[PDB]
Symmetry: C3
Subunit: 171 residues, 3 copies
């Protein structure tokens, strides 16, 4: 099962259609939208600044979501966050994908439909342009995404919505 | 206190001599062999492609094992997988060691008895030659392993068999 | 909601003023000091060499603390260890900060009040001088810390003590 705690005057607001997996911790000022999914072992501590997660977002296994003072963690609709990602006061725009094993730091902004490659580091305040591939440590813009890249990102988002409904039933 | 779930027509097949630690998640199409050990907080989701783990394998704490479509995750006998490793449709051949904090990506093949150094990234489709030390991001061959290296690899594998037997009793 | 196990003749010695979060695993030869905090999903296995954690230390979420033979894991007073850090037989001196997503390897020594930047790797046996900023893979010394840097390090340490007191009460 999972752990959900208040932090002072703030308690998590989680959509009835969201999936919260086993061994998940969510605390404090966290909002999670419709058909979104928080996968096994993930931690979302909403005790420094607001956390706002949109609709149809998947936050994959063993992620850590946290904030620095006065820097909200904002994850817009249709975002995929890969396994073992660290988001710290990141702004992640609609339909972006954060490659598994990446670290996204304070104030960093990931543009709409951008792809951060696996294992990347996006340093504080850095902006990744919309619909680009960026990877490395620190992440560099590599190229513009193609329709093939975008269709793969759409497939993963849809697959996670379905798998979330399957596991929510099994649990 | 682990969680074991079926996925559609597949349920995990785990040897009676395996150790499954607390807070472990294992789902779907997963086979785990004799005397293998899956350590605290590890996630193995067998919901995209088959996962086959051999005998006397240790998968250390906080690992994440997953697949991409049509790319099986294969971990052969006598493999050591270090703390906090991400394996995504990796092929890890007999007796290899995956250094703690490494990321091994889709269709990457780790040669028999190879040593991937701590903190490495092996990119999709990349092959690490048998019995080499390779490290970095991306991982580069450094040297051929010596008898001293092989004795260290033997010690870790045998120590994890003994620790797994101890904790299985304590749990 | 935590797991605490002995290892042979050693059981963890944890101060009554320490906070041990949910889904934490602590085993064996581990000492944790006064007003220290071990955050969600962290693993501290004290089964290879001694682990000594001082007073007012925060070990953030999803950390893994382990040892190699004959190399104690030493974390002195007033240390901050960031989210998703791996410490393996590290020596971390008083008031140092280990940036989130870093890996500190066997016999590496982090000098008093030093700052290891997020996402860094400190290789085995490497020393980071007192009161410096170091980052990268492997970590390079960049500059001497300023009073502004030290005040940021003090703010984080003090904020964690108080939050630890809050969650310990809620739990
Ligand atoms: Zn944080
Ligand atoms: Zn046997
Ligand atoms: Zn995956
Ligand atoms: Zn063998
Ligand atoms: Zn990690
Ligand atoms: Zn034995
Ligand atoms: Zn270890």
């Amino acid at each position: 099962s999972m752990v959900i705690y208040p932090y002072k005057d703030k308690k998590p607001i989680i959509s009835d259609s969201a999936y919260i997996a086993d061994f998940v911790t969510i605390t404090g000022d966290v909002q999670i939208g419709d058909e979104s999914s928080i996968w096994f072992q993930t931690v979302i501590r909403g005790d420094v600044a607001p956390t706002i997660i949109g609709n149809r977002v998947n936050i994959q296994d063993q992620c850590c979501l946290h904030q620095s003072p006065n820097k909200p963690l904002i994850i817009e609709d249709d975002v995929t966050v890969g396994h073992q990602v660290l988001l710290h006061s990141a702004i992640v725009r609609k339909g972006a994908l954060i490659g598994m094993g990446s670290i996204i730091l304070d104030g960093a902004e990931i543009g709409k439909g951008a792809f951060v490659g696996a294992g990347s580091l996006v340093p504080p305040g850095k902006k990744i342009p919309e619909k680009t591939l960026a990877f490395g440590r620190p992440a560099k813009v590599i190229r513009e995404l193609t329709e093939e890249d975008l269709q793969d990102m759409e497939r993963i988002r849809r697959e996670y919505i379905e798998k979330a409904q399957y596991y929510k039933n099994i649990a």
